[PDB]
């Protein structure tokens, strides 16, 4: 977690939580106040398997926020996808609707391709136009012989 402290950037390590210890709630509506809803779905998570339940709000990129202050005025035609574990949870009309994997979503790339391949090992065999025996034999008469 980070925060701009003027011109430098204060950071603090985030504590990990297992996804099986995290569940999402069905309704994104606010019980107390009609006409207002939660921007992101509510979650219930436990720091450990045997630990007590703790309420919270789903942040960005599998973040568990301890305060449920993400509030927006209600709007019709509400369709949202939220990152959850390795996939998405789909909420329609501020209610849990479906769950999807990343393979079920069309993928576009921000990456620029660069295909670099290694030069391959090459072997040089011995090669001569004329061997020294051939050059010796080209003479018509050999004095020694």
């Amino acid at each position: 977690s980070a925060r701009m402290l003027g011109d430098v950037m204060a950071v603090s390590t985030c504590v990990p939580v297992a996804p099986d210890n995290v569940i999402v709630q069905n309704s994104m509506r606010v019980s107390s106040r009609p006409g207002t809803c939660y921007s992101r779905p509510l979650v219930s998570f436990r720091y450990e398997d045997q630990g007590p339940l703790i309420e919270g709000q789903l942040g960005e990129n599998n973040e568990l926020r301890l305060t449920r202050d993400a509030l927006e005025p209600c709007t019709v035609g509400h369709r949202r996808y939220f990152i959850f574990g390795g996939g998405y949870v789909y909420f329609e009309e501020y209610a849990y609707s479906h769950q999807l994997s990343r393979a079920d979503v069309t993928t576009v790339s921000t990456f620029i391709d660069l295909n670099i391949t290694m030069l391959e090992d090459h072997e040089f065999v011995p090669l001569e136009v004329y061997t020294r025996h051939e050059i010796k034999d080209s003479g018509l008469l050999d004095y020694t012989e």
Partner: nanobody, 125 residues
Framework: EVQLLESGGGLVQPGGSLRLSCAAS????????VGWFRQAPGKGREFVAT????????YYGDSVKGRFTISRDNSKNTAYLQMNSLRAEDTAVYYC??????????????????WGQGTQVTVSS
């Protein structure tokens, strides 16, 4: 939505082995806790086993241990129930159920959203 089918049920003698397959159609299988629920004839429905949505947790019923093994294959979008050494009281009417990552009450049947037709298995001497 996700539609589930069951295959592999049949007549099996005591002490036999079987593998049931629950095949899912649609999207979002990998984000789905998948389990089985068996209802005895002339009797209600009871929990059997359930693999978690991440696949790292395997919860079982209070009556069976070391007999039923639920294991999920995301590549085929299926869940396999390996059933070993069936007793007379083991046989029942088996349904496959699925639910999103929205409840820890895997034992409770009312929590699951996707319900299938089920399969027939019989234990008889």
């Amino acid at each position: 939505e996700v539609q589930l089918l069951e295959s592999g049920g049949g007549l099996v003698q005591p002490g036999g082995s079987l593998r049931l397959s629950c095949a899912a159609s649609g999207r979002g299988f990998s984000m789905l806790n998948v389990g089985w629920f068996r209802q005895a004839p002339g009797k209600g429905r009871e929990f059997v086993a359930t693999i978690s949505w991440t696949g790292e947790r395997t919860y079982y019923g209070d009556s069976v241990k070391g007999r039923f093994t639920i294991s999920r294959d995301n590549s085929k979008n299926t869940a396999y129930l390996q059933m070993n050494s069936l007793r007379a009281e083991d046989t029942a009417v088996y349904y496959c159920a699925a639910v999103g990552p929205k409840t820890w009450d895997y034992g409770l049947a009312s929590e699951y959203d996707y319900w299938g037709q089920g399969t027939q298995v019989t234990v008889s001497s």
